[PDB]
Each structure stands twice: as C-alpha cells, then as structure tokens.
Nucleic acid binder design. Structure first.
Ligand SMILES: [K+]
Ligand SMILES: [K+]
Ligand SMILES: [K+]
Ligand SMILES: [K+]
Ligand SMILES: [K+]
Ligand SMILES: [K+]
Ligand SMILES: [K+]
Ligand SMILES: [K+]
Ligand SMILES: [K+]
Ligand SMILES: [K+]
Ligand SMILES: [K+]
Ligand SMILES: [K+]
Ligand SMILES: [Mg+2]
Ligand SMILES: [Mg+2]
Ligand SMILES: [Mg+2]
Ligand SMILES: [Mg+2]
Ligand SMILES: [Mg+2]
Ligand SMILES: [Mg+2]
Ligand SMILES: [Mg+2]
Ligand SMILES: [Mg+2]
Ligand SMILES: [Mg+2]
Ligand SMILES: [Mg+2]
Ligand SMILES: [Mg+2]
Ligand SMILES: [Mg+2]
Ligand SMILES: [Mg+2]
Ligand SMILES: [Mg+2]
Ligand SMILES: [Mg+2]
Ligand SMILES: [Mg+2]
Ligand SMILES: [Mg+2]
Ligand SMILES: [Mg+2]
Ligand SMILES: [Mg+2]
Ligand SMILES: [Mg+2]
Ligand SMILES: [Mg+2]
Ligand SMILES: [Mg+2]
Ligand SMILES: [Mg+2]
Ligand SMILES: [Mg+2]
Ligand SMILES: [Mg+2]
Ligand SMILES: [Mg+2]
Ligand SMILES: [Mg+2]
Ligand SMILES: [Mg+2]
Ligand SMILES: [Mg+2]
Ligand SMILES: [Mg+2]
Ligand SMILES: [Mg+2]
Ligand SMILES: [Mg+2]
Ligand SMILES: [Mg+2]
Ligand SMILES: [Mg+2]
Ligand SMILES: [Mg+2]
Ligand SMILES: [Mg+2]
Ligand SMILES: [Mg+2]
Ligand SMILES: [Mg+2]
Ligand SMILES: [Mg+2]
Ligand SMILES: [Mg+2]
Ligand SMILES: [Mg+2]
Ligand SMILES: [Mg+2]
Ligand SMILES: [Mg+2]
Ligand SMILES: [Mg+2]
Ligand SMILES: [Mg+2]
Ligand SMILES: [Mg+2]
Ligand SMILES: [Mg+2]
Ligand SMILES: [Mg+2]
Ligand SMILES: [Mg+2]
Ligand SMILES: [Mg+2]
Ligand SMILES: [Mg+2]
Ligand SMILES: [Mg+2]
Ligand SMILES: [Mg+2]
Lengths: 119, 155, 73
RNA sequence: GUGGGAGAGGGUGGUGGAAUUCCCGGAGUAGCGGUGAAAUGCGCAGAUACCGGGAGGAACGCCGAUGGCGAAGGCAGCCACCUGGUCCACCCGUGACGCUGAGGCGCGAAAGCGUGGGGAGCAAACCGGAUUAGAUACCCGGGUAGUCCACGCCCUAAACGAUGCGCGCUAGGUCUCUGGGUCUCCUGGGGGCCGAAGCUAACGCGUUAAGCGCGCCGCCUGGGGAGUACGGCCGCAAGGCUGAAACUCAAAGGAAUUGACGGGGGCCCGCACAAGCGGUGGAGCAUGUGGUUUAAUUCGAAGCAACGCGAAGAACCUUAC
C-alpha cells in the first residue's frame, strides 16, 4: 500500500510467456504477474489466454494499491500480446494510452544461431 | 460429405403433439426399426409425466431437451507434437442431436425396470436440472472452458 | 501503393543539404524517427542520398531523433 | 590539358545513437528461462519484468534498391585529413608513344599460424539436458580456441557471370544509375530485362555476345587410381604450387524428353476421414485356413485382389489321397 491511482503497465510478450509489470509514474514496480504467477507451467505460459489471466492478476493486485488509470507500454512480439492489452482495458483500469517500445538494435550483437540470417 | 453441404432431413410431425422434435426423440428411442414399439414408449412415458405433474408432458419434454443442450464442447486437432483438445461453440443442430441422443442414453442407464418409466423419469429429472443427461452436458461444458488455453485454435 | 502525398509535394523550396532546418527535415521521418522511403519522400535517387546524409548529421547534433516510440497499438 | 560530376574505392585519426552483457542504486516478488513436450540452468545471498547511473566489447537499424565503387578478394553510422580509379564537355597540347603478356613483383574472403593486446555477444572442441532402436547429430542450457585490434605469416575457395584481356563490325524495345544538350527528346559512360540477324547439343546467348572477325596469354585431351606418390620449390606449422605410374573400368558426362516418384506446391474426388448407427476382436458353435498329426488327411487359392474362395450339396459315389 501507498496509494498511486495512476501509473504504468508494462507488457513483455514472448513466444514463451507474457509478463505484466505495473509501476508508479516514475517506473517503479508496484505489482506484477505472468503465466507462471498464475497456475500455468510449461508451454501454456505463452498462450494468449494465460496472458489475459496474467494481465488481470496484475490489474487487480494494482487496485489494492488503489490505482485507477495507466499508460500501457508494450514490448515484444508474442502470441498473447494483444490479449494483454484488451485484458487491461476491460478491467476497471483506464487505459489512457498504448505504446509499443520493443527494443531493436541498429545491428549490434550477433544473434544466437537460432535467430540468425539477421543481425 | 466432400462435394455438397449435406442438407438436413425433414421429419413428419408427431401423430399427436404434431411436433417434429417429438418424432426426432421417437427415432432415437427406436431400435431395429420398431417405430411402433418406439412410439408407444414415448407416449406411455409421456402420460406418466402427468399424474406426477399437473403440467403438460410436451412442455416438460421440450424443456428437458433444453437443459441438456451443450453450448461448448471440446474437439481434437493435431498441431505438431500431439493433439490439443480445442473448445468451441456447438452448432444449433448438434445441440439438439446431442441433447436427444443423451436423454435416451441416460434414460436407459436408469434402474427403473420398464422403458416408458425410464424415459419418463429421465424426462422429468432433466426438466428440473438433474439426471444423467444434464450431468453429461455439464461434463462436456466443463471439458471446454477447462481448455480455454487452446481457445486460439478457433477453426 | 502509399498514395498519401509525397513529402516533396507538401512542401516547396529547401536546401536538401541544410542539416539544421529541423522544421523541414523533420518531415522526412516516420511516426518513428526513421528516414522515409523514396516511396513517401517523393525525392529521387540523388536527392534522397543527400537527404539521408543530412538527416544523420542532424541526429548527431541532437536536432533530430534516431528512434521514437510508436503511439497507439 | 582546362572545366565539371557521381560513388559503401583505399588508409589514419576522431566521434554518435540503438541493443546485448556485467556492475551499482531504487522499486518489487516467485518465478524466469526454454521446447513438440520437457529437462539441464538461473532465482528468497531476491532472479525475471520496470526505472536511474556506470563500464566495456563488437556491429552499424531506417535510408537501402531491382542502387553504387573497386582489378579481384571486397567495400555500408557520422566527421576531418591523406590517397587511387573513373565518367562527361571543350577539340586545346603530344604525335602510334599501341594491344597482349611466359617468368618476376604486388594484392588476395573465411578458416588457420606466430607475438602482444582485447573479450560484450556469438561459438569448433568440450561439459551437461532432451530425443532415438542407438544419437559420438539434429533441439535446449553452458562454453575454450576463435570471432575483434596491431604487427608478421598463410595464399585457399562454388576466389562464379562456373564466361581471360583489347579493338573493330552486326535491328530494335523497355527499366534504371551518373554526365552533357537546342532538355516531349537527343547524346556519352555503367547496371538490368525482352528480343533482329546470327550462334548453340540443348538450355540458352544476343551492342554488357555465347554473333561476325584480328592480336596475345592461360588451359583441356575418357572414368577410377589421385590432386594421391616421388622429386623440387615455398611455409613456423597446418599445408600450398608443380604433379605422375602400375593397376582397372565401358563407360564417366552435358542438355533436353516422356514417365514414375517427393516426409514439393495448387485445384478436386471416393463410406477415405470426420459425423453417426450397428458390428468383428472376448463366449459357444458353424464353416474356410495356418499348423500339427496321420497309412492318407488329394489339389489348388496368399496382402488389398487367399481364407462360407474353385465345392450351386465329400457317408459309398463324387475323389483326384
Ligand atoms: K546490387
Ligand atoms: K591449434
Ligand atoms: K578482420
Ligand atoms: K598477409
Ligand atoms: K539531363
Ligand atoms: K534452337
Ligand atoms: K532457364
Ligand atoms: K612433395
Ligand atoms: K620447412
Ligand atoms: K598452405
Ligand atoms: K501434389
Ligand atoms: K470405410
Ligand atoms: Mg514457456
Ligand atoms: Mg577533371
Ligand atoms: Mg568507401
Ligand atoms: Mg548502452
Ligand atoms: Mg538492483
Ligand atoms: Mg531491494
Ligand atoms: Mg535449484
Ligand atoms: Mg527469505
Ligand atoms: Mg546474490
Ligand atoms: Mg537482467
Ligand atoms: Mg539499466
Ligand atoms: Mg570486460
Ligand atoms: Mg567493374
Ligand atoms: Mg561477390
Ligand atoms: Mg579522386
Ligand atoms: Mg588538337
Ligand atoms: Mg604537329
Ligand atoms: Mg588471406
Ligand atoms: Mg581471419
Ligand atoms: Mg591469433
Ligand atoms: Mg591472443
Ligand atoms: Mg584476457
Ligand atoms: Mg551461448
Ligand atoms: Mg541417450
Ligand atoms: Mg549450444
Ligand atoms: Mg556467383
Ligand atoms: Mg546497326
Ligand atoms: Mg538496353
Ligand atoms: Mg547501355
Ligand atoms: Mg543507358
Ligand atoms: Mg549492378
Ligand atoms: Mg532467330
Ligand atoms: Mg529444344
Ligand atoms: Mg538476352
Ligand atoms: Mg566483341
Ligand atoms: Mg592445369
Ligand atoms: Mg586415367
Ligand atoms: Mg586409363
Ligand atoms: Mg586423371
Ligand atoms: Mg589440396
Ligand atoms: Mg618455412
Ligand atoms: Mg541432367
Ligand atoms: Mg460421393
Ligand atoms: Mg456411396
Ligand atoms: Mg468414422
Ligand atoms: Mg461403435
Ligand atoms: Mg469370436
Ligand atoms: Mg485337410
Ligand atoms: Mg493339412
Ligand atoms: Mg497342381
Ligand atoms: Mg488346403
Ligand atoms: Mg464370400
Ligand atoms: Mg470317398
């Protein structure tokens, strides 16, 4: 508890999981969730469904700090990224805005052999 | 059905309630094409729904069929690695086909010693939210929704 | 087909080599701080090649962004 | 020569932002990660996700191309310096000063070698986790050389357009990069595409020739043995260049054709699957068969397409044993 009322909601989508982090206006985490926090284990953490659940778990836990509106900040490309956006919108929390800030290098480190034929 | 879309069959309405749905149920109760014996059964049982209920049998019948209709069911679908039980809406027609098939099935699982009694009691018990059929309908519905994680395999 | 309106049309005279004209160079970047294609700039091989270089000079001068986060989504 | 032009051509120094990793601080809590599914792994000594600060290495997103530069290998953030090639215009100067080029000399991707430095990410070997019949692999988690810089070696390649260099000649159309002009268009240099004639085994090539011709260099002479052996030369080494023989084969081979095939694509059918209703597989028995047994158990039928099949009538007969 501290009472924030307005903050940030970071979505980190991956082809392996989705994990939501909610922070204060300065980017300090208040609460967080993920397909793992919810009961999911292996490959299902990446499911769009799980993302929904993780997103809702996050919102609710954020209501406890008495938060109402947030700025969604999406990072990554992964099955279940948009469900998280929707999950948040439909959860009391007011979504003042969505913004994609997935990091991309201006070609820096050689990728793993799995993600090559790129740089 | 590779070429066409397979149109549905039409059935002569009931020789009593003049209802098609009734005939459908009659046919599911049928066996070895003994439609006469089949018809009797539904009727006797249809009577037994009264003098046990002040209500009309048809209203009872039609509402049992209703509570047994599944709104979601899980179907298979291989997606490299194994088969994922995918949940999904059940078409208006399969609901009916399933509902009736299930009633006759649960009915015949009952202990009541004679047919008409069994269909009768299953009809009734179903009408108020209980009985073999409704159980099935709920195990199915529970199956779907229990696999929400594979909902994105729409189809 | 991108039939919006070539950035060259919606504009007039300007020194493609002026790395300080923020108000005009700014126009050749996308929602993101990315240099727009000839498709959108409407410029030409030679013109674009000179634009690309002047824009990059502006970036190192802090008058222009290298990248900017996308709004909406 | 004079005047213009375009360019990731080369060398040296400087420098910018994104990202990864690590370290520090904050905030926050039970997982993160990873796969077909998992596990190894990492995390309560607090990880992952989020914000702020710092260090370091390597590589330059968009622009970016079907583009450009170079003799090739190759060259891509931005700035300055040093430096190569090249194209156009003007017809200004020299006056055949030319082409080619054995040997020589230089350059020459990657890997690799030596010395010293650096080391973020990646990753031979290697250590583990899965997978499999096995799995000294494919997939996952780690990880040393190396990948980076300097200096010195190595000198290879599908070092490819699989097409040596130069010059003249032989329809056009179309796109494009860069220059000049009376700037719908013309004219020069380069990059593509379609094509005249012609060439080609065919495929295809076709003013960017694989056409028609001249000059000079390099190279080929069936396949295996073999790019091996020997010798010589070169290298620190790895190994490079030159490069055989005995023996042996009736072929090896190029292009195109019709098929068949594909764990290639597209379109489409069938009780093919699915949907569904009844059943076989278990029992008893009937019948055919395998097997075994017998003096004989007559013969045939064999996955689908043999097995209540020839047998629409085996007590003798039929009947072949
Ligand atoms: K090119
Ligand atoms: K070694
Ligand atoms: K190098
Ligand atoms: K060298
Ligand atoms: K011009
Ligand atoms: K021909
Ligand atoms: K061809
Ligand atoms: K030798
Ligand atoms: K030696
Ligand atoms: K060598
Ligand atoms: K096919
Ligand atoms: K069948
Ligand atoms: Mg996962
Ligand atoms: Mg000049
Ligand atoms: Mg250059
Ligand atoms: Mg950084
Ligand atoms: Mg910390
Ligand atoms: Mg702390
Ligand atoms: Mg542990
Ligand atoms: Mg503790
Ligand atoms: Mg610790
Ligand atoms: Mg981290
Ligand atoms: Mg940080
Ligand atoms: Mg370090
Ligand atoms: Mg060239
Ligand atoms: Mg090349
Ligand atoms: Mg020059
Ligand atoms: Mg003269
Ligand atoms: Mg003279
Ligand atoms: Mg070399
Ligand atoms: Mg090297
Ligand atoms: Mg070394
Ligand atoms: Mg070293
Ligand atoms: Mg060291
Ligand atoms: Mg690694
Ligand atoms: Mg094993
Ligand atoms: Mg590995
Ligand atoms: Mg090539
Ligand atoms: Mg001509
Ligand atoms: Mg042309
Ligand atoms: Mg040309
Ligand atoms: Mg041209
Ligand atoms: Mg080209
Ligand atoms: Mg011809
Ligand atoms: Mg031919
Ligand atoms: Mg051609
Ligand atoms: Mg010629
Ligand atoms: Mg030779
Ligand atoms: Mg020979
Ligand atoms: Mg021979
Ligand atoms: Mg030979
Ligand atoms: Mg060799
Ligand atoms: Mg030596
Ligand atoms: Mg061939
Ligand atoms: Mg059909
Ligand atoms: Mg049929
Ligand atoms: Mg079926
Ligand atoms: Mg069945
Ligand atoms: Mg049996
Ligand atoms: Mg016999
Ligand atoms: Mg026998
Ligand atoms: Mg015979
Ligand atoms: Mg026989
Ligand atoms: Mg038969
Ligand atoms: Mg006999």
């Amino acid at each position: 508890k501290r009472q924030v009322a307005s903050g940030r909601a970071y979505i980190h989508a991956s082809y392996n999981n989705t994990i939501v982090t909610i922070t204060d206006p300065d980017g300090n985490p208040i609460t967080w969730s993920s397909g793992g926090v919810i009961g999911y284990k292996g490959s299902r953490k990446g499911t769009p469904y799980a993302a929904q659940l993780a997103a809702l778990d996050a919102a609710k836990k954020a209501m406890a700090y008495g938060m109402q509106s947030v700025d969604v900040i999406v990072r990554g490309t992964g099955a279940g990224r948009e469900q998280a956006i929707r999950a948040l919108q439909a959860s009391g929390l007011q979504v003042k805005s969505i913004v994609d800030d997935t990091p991309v290098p201006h070609n820096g480190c050689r990728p793993k052999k799995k993600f090559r034929k790129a740089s | 059905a590779r070429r066409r879309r397979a149109e549905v069959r039409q059935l002569q309405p009931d020789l009593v309630y003049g209802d098609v749905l009734v005939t459908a149920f009659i046919n599911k109760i049928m066996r070895d094409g003994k439609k006469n014996l089949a018809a009797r059964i539904f009727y006797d049982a249809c009577k037994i729904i009264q003098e046990k209920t002040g209500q009309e049998p048809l209203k009872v019948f039609k509402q049992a069929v209703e509570n047994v209709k599944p709104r979601m069911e899980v179907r298979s679908r291989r997606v490299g690695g194994a088969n994922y039980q995918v949940p999904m809406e059940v078409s208006p027609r399969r609901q009916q086909s399933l509902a009736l098939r299930w009633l006759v099935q649960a009915a015949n699982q009952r202990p009541e010693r004679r047919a008409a009694v069994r269909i009768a009691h299953e009809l009734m018990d179903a009408a108020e939210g209980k009985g073999g059929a409704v159980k099935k309908k709920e195990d199915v519905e529970r199956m779907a929704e229990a696999n929400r994680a594979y909902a994105h395999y729409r189809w | 087909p991108s039939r919006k309106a070539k950035v060259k049309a919606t504009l007039g005279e300007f020194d493609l080599r002026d790395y300080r004209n923020v108000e005009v160079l700014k126009r050749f970047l996308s929602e993101t701080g990315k240099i727009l294609p000839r498709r959108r700039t409407g410029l030409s091989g030679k013109e674009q090649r000179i634009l690309a270089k002047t824009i990059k000079r502006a970036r190192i001068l802090g008058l222009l962004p290298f990248t900017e986060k996308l709004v909406r989504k």
